[PDB]
Ligand binder design. Sequence first.
Ligand SMILES: Nc1ncnc2c1ncn2[C@@H]1O[C@H](COP(=O)(O)OP(=O)(O)OP(O)(O)=S)[C@@H](O)[C@H]1O
Ligand SMILES: Nc1ncnc2c1ncn2[C@@H]1O[C@H](COP(=O)(O)OP(=O)(O)OP(O)(O)=S)[C@@H](O)[C@H]1O
Ligand SMILES: [Mg+2]
Ligand SMILES: [Zn+2]
Ligand SMILES: [Zn+2]
Lengths: 385, 385
Amino acid sequence: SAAQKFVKQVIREAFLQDASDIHIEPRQNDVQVRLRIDGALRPYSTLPKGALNAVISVVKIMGGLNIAEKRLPQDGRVRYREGAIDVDLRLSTLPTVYGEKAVMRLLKKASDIPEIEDLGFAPGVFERFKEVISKPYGIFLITGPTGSGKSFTTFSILKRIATPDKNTQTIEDPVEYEIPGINQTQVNPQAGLTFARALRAFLRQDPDIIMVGEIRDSETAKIATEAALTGHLVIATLHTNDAAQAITRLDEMGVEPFNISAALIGVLSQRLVRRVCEHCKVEVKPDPETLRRLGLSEAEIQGARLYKGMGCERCGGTGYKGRYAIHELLVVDDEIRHAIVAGKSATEIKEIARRKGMKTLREDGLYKALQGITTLEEVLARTIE
Amino acid sequence: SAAQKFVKQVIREAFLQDASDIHIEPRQNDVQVRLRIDGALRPYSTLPKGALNAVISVVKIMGGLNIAEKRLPQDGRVRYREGAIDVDLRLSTLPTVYGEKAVMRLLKKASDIPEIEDLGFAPGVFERFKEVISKPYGIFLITGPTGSGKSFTTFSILKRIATPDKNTQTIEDPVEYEIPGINQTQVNPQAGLTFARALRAFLRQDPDIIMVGEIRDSETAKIATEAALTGHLVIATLHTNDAAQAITRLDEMGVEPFNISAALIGVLSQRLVRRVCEHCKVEVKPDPETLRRLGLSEAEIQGARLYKGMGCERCGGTGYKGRYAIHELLVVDDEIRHAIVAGKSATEIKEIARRKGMKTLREDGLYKALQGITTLEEVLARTIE
Ligand SMILES: Nc1ncnc2c1ncn2[C@@H]1O[C@H](COP(=O)(O)OP(=O)(O)OP(O)(O)=S)[C@@H](O)[C@H]1O
Ligand SMILES: Nc1ncnc2c1ncn2[C@@H]1O[C@H](COP(=O)(O)OP(=O)(O)OP(O)(O)=S)[C@@H](O)[C@H]1O
Ligand SMILES: [Mg+2]
Ligand SMILES: [Zn+2]
Ligand SMILES: [Zn+2]
């Protein structure tokens, strides 16, 4: 609790300062602590060398990390409420030559779950998206790397489709949000209430819409798929970078390809790019050759404006305030499941979908960058694979 | 006794309203109770939040569930008798963030099962339906999501064709109705009595008619087809959005296409639409332009009498009371047989079937909406065409 009270004092003073990050760094003879204020790291405090393991355990408990594991990096998430400071923290631990270093990123205050029309879909992709989630049943997968806005998009969907004539039931680890009109159930491993234990009880609970917060079992993948097969609408998340790899991911978790093919409505992969500041924004002229290589049509290449923030402190550092989302939406059709039943590659499906008109993250990112929402760099950074 | 009084009333009201399920839902500041009627959830009442644990208690006593346990789902069965009420109830309790939700399902009986004349078949389809079930051997598939009326149709058929000169054998998970005249067997995991293990045994039981409640696995799909092949009549349920996809799905499940083309009598795809309440029923002047994009001809727009129910006390305000089935009946002939082998797609099969006389779900829906059985939107909400 010497350790616990230090950790809680740091997060507090980080919150009140509007600090973005907190670094706990072992050194040769001490542990330095630093806070990023207005873009720069500042010295907060100094802990003795022996104090290291104590503190690292406290933040590991907070994010559900493994204490025993010290040779490998771990990431986690901390929903932190103590009194008047509620901040969500992104947690990172890293093996360092002097012991384990921890970094906690203070996330922007979430605000409220938006309507479907304010998620930042391209006008064209939006219509196909609205058609995927309006379907009576089947499973709709939302994927992306840690913190790409999966849960946020998921609840925006539920906000739309969970009508009083339906039973919307939810399994989450943990439950975020107090969204009305639906029933929410949190995973309890203490009790024995796993994802699969719950998901099987849900089938005896007369559901219409099932939201599976996370699929990380074979049991869960199988049950969610059969729920989609028998006539329920399932929304679930995976942690996969490619929309097509989500299909392959399910094959690996033990789902029969013919069941994947019969239930899957589509897969949404998204990213978050920083938004350029509207105030210190400037026009930039792109190398036509770059645009060309990015698959942008010649005949579109003359309008040709890209944008970037030089910076003020409405931005702080950066030229960026806020984040926006990037999407590629794999809508399953007669030909795609016609590729899943056959031996597939994620690769083959992707271009089988691109033809038929599927717009890719980079294409989606590029086009929003052409609007001055984001830089081309942020777009490239998120789509490099 | 106040919680006893509530449970008594809500089951009484569900019974008289023909309600599938009672939902008792803990929410943030109250308890909400919903009735599913005609497949649609409907608000029944609100309880004050501190009355939850008394009500759940009554429900648990009925089904012999543990009161102490509130962290894990529970399941029960009760034969409920109050006044003249005699219903079997299936009880489900499930922990949510605001406490345990309860679902009580009102179960049907054999007496509720219709005669095939009352299944709602259009006159042209009904004559073909009859010729399909009156064949000596082959496999007949009934497909669609849960709550489509698959079991009602199945046993309706067995009421007409399980005459006393034949052995009529059933494998079910679970056995729902107790039917006179036929032999029924329930799937039992704990003993190892699979669908496939049961079905293997049926072939040494001198059967005539075989009913497979559900085809989930690849082995069951093969043995049921084999049993059809050798000279037995097989009625089985599958989940597909479409009659033609039942062919493709058997393929995907591993059945040899030459075996499918050899054994398959036909497929029935089925949905349930809501009937227009006839205490609200008000005639509505059709819009021709909207009836033209919907593939209806000029002749059909004449002789078109649409209706919509202007909500009343008897329909709970919905404008609907009762349900009705819409049908897509694929009847296998030689051309469909040659297309099943030669591995044509479901879309190819479907277009063959229609040219040969098959009405799609949408078309059967539209046809009955023009009779004022149901409304247009119900047809559009229950069919992706
Ligand atoms: N479309 C969006 N635009 C801007 N910010 C967003 C958007 N979606 C999410 N965010 C924010 O970004 C953070 C991402 O949180 P989530 O939406 O929960 O991400 P996630 O993919 O669920 O991440 P996990 O669950 O930790 S792997 C939250 O702080 C959201 O406020
Ligand atoms: N032809 C019909 N017309 C009107 N209501 C019907 C009809 N068939 C079924 N129903 C109602 O719909 C409910 C569900 O029908 P079921 O046949 O039991 O459902 P199913 O999901 O299609 O088949 P299962 O999963 O093996 S019970 C029945 O219990 C009846 O209340
Ligand atoms: Mg999440
Ligand atoms: Zn700026
Ligand atoms: Zn009415």
